[PDB]
């Protein structure tokens, strides 16, 4: 199961100054980049075009090129329409894309956030507000739903284009997606808390536990998954122990890349 995400972030400082930046993820791997400075969408992988031909891609990019300009003016015009109820600075975020399932099954989404709060989505054939959204958005929503051409485009984009494009991506980038990178471990201590560092592994699923012989330590607290630049992962597991009890403790690491031979590291 892979989630394809188009993450757009837009900042409106005042009536004139505006910028829109987009990044695109397939799972936890970046496939596209679109800086405000760039007129075109950038491939961050050799297989970012998927199974789309050059003609198909140019037509698709062109639509986004029109969208970015149109979106910017639309927000600006909607701020004028709500004033003085809503005012700059304004932050808008879009989370668009589709999740792929076994068979021909997929599920598309388009979520919109306003000042960091999820308020609007595209659902079915129209825009709608989600539970918790402020009522004033009903005017923007009525205005966006008047635009029949945008509705038909978005419908086709979510229902047809996304799953088609992502099915192509999953074929073209099979190597990268299914890559196996070996974790590397090292130990350290702070004033006492013992730390087991695990870094350089792909994919994300990993098992890290402090061991006293063959008994798993209950106090083992795993930290968050932190990213490396080369698209590998980092994670540390800590254990609080009384000084002197250091001897007999080890760190066992299980990962799909090691293939049975778990990394064992004695203190």
């Amino acid at each position, epitope marked *: 199961n892979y989630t394809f995400r188009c993450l757009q972030m837009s900042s409106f400082a005042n009536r004139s100054w505006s910028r829109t930046d987009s990044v695109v993820w397939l799972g936890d791997l970046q496939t596209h980049r679109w800086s405000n400075d760039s007129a075109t969408i950038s491939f961050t992988k050799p297989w970012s075009q998927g199974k789309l031909s050059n003609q198909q891609w140019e037509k698709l990019q062109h639509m986004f090129q*029109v969208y970015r*300009v*149109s979106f910017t*003016r*639309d927000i600006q*015009e*909607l701020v*004028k*329409m709500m*004033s003085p109820k809503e005012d700059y600075p304004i932050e808008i975020q879009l989370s668009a894309g589709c999740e792929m399932y076994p068979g021909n099954a997929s599920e598309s989404f388009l979520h919109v956030a306003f000042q960091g709060k999820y308020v609007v989505r595209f659902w079915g054939t129209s825009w709608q507000t989600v539970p918790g959204a402020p009522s004033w958005l009903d005017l923007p929503i*009525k*205005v*966006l739903n*008047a*635009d*029949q*051409g*945008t509705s038909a485009t978005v419908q086709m984009l979510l229902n047809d284009t996304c799953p088609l494009f992502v099915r192509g991506l999953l074929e073209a980038g099979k190597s990268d997606l299914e890559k196996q990178e070996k974790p590397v471990a090292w130990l350290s201590s702070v004033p006492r808390q013992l730390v087991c560092h695990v870094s350089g592994f792909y994919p994300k699923p990993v098992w890290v536990m402090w061991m006293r012989g063959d008994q798993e330590q209950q106090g083992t607290h795993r930290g968050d998954f932190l990213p490396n630049a080369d698209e590998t992962w980092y994670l540390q597991a800590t254990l609080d122990v009384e000084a002197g009890e250091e001897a007999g403790l080890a760190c066992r690491v299980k990962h799909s890349s090691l293939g049975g031979q778990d990394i064992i590291l004695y203190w």
Partner: T-cell receptor, first 111, second 113 residues
Framework: AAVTQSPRNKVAVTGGKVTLSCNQTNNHNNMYWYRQDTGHGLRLIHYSYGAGSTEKGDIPDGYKASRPSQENFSLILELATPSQTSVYFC??????????FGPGTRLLVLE | TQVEQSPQSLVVRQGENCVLQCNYSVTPDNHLRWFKQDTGKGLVSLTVLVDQKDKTSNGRYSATLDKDAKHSTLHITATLLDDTATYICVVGDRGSALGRLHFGAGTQLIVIP
């Protein structure tokens, strides 16, 4: 959906105050002011999304707009100039794309 | 000047047909509208074209729109004296009130009775 303009025709002097009024009963939120000059298409001066709201258009200089109510959008020329001699059209519309136009207002500003 | 009309002006004899061209560079192009304007009078809507490759009709008035070529024509069949008017091409960049209308300078038609 009908729109009216008053006056329909005006002769004015430089430095004079000219007010062009536009009334719609369609309960439309949005109203627009255009001017038409031979050899150009209609150009947007000011617009409004609701009462109390006025927005600069493409050629707003020399003009001030007023929206006291949903029914009335008003184009005010504080210091009239000969360059403001034109035919002035007003329009209204709801959330849709269609703008419904008034019959026009002919203005002449003499020295 | 994102909307260009051709011819600038034209003279036809009653009963004859004429074609009026409208070419534009407006982006994006939601709809195209043809106005009729009598000297002195206001803007009477003739037809609005909305589709990628669209065709419309209104009695003696017919029209086409090609969004790829960014081009539209207005055909008048069997011109009458009352056709003497300026014909204006307008392009809306949205399917909603968020849009701006982009006006051509018009095409002047004179029908000789």
């Amino acid at each position: 959906a009908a729109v009216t303009q008053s006056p329909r025709n005006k002769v004015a002097v430089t430095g004079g105050k000219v007010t062009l009024s536009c009334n719609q009963t369609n309960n439309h939120n949005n109203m627009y002011w255009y001017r038409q000059d031979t050899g150009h298409g209609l150009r947007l001066i000011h617009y409004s999304y609701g009462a109390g709201s006025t927005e600069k258009g493409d050629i707003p200089d020399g003009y001030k707009a007023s929206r006291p109510s949903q029914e009335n959008f008003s184009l005010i020329l504080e210091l009239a100039t000969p360059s403001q001699t034109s035919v002035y059209f007003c329009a209204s519309g709801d959330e849709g794309y269609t703008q419904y136009f008034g019959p026009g207002t002919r203005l002449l500003v003499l020295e | 000047t994102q909307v260009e009309q051709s011819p600038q002006s034209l003279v036809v004899r009653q009963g004859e047909n004429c074609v009026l061209q409208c070419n534009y560079s407006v982006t994006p192009d939601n709809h195209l509208r043809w106005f009729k304007q009598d000297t002195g009078k206001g803007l009477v809507s003739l037809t609005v074209l909305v589709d990628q490759k669209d065709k419309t009709s209104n009695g003696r008035y017919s029209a086409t729109l090609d969004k790829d070529a960014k081009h539209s024509t207005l055909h008048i069949t069997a011109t009458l004296l009352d056709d003497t008017a300026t014909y204006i091409c307008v392009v809306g960049d949205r399917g909603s009130a968020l849009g701006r209308l982009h006006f051509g300078a018009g095409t002047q038609l004179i029908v000789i009775p």
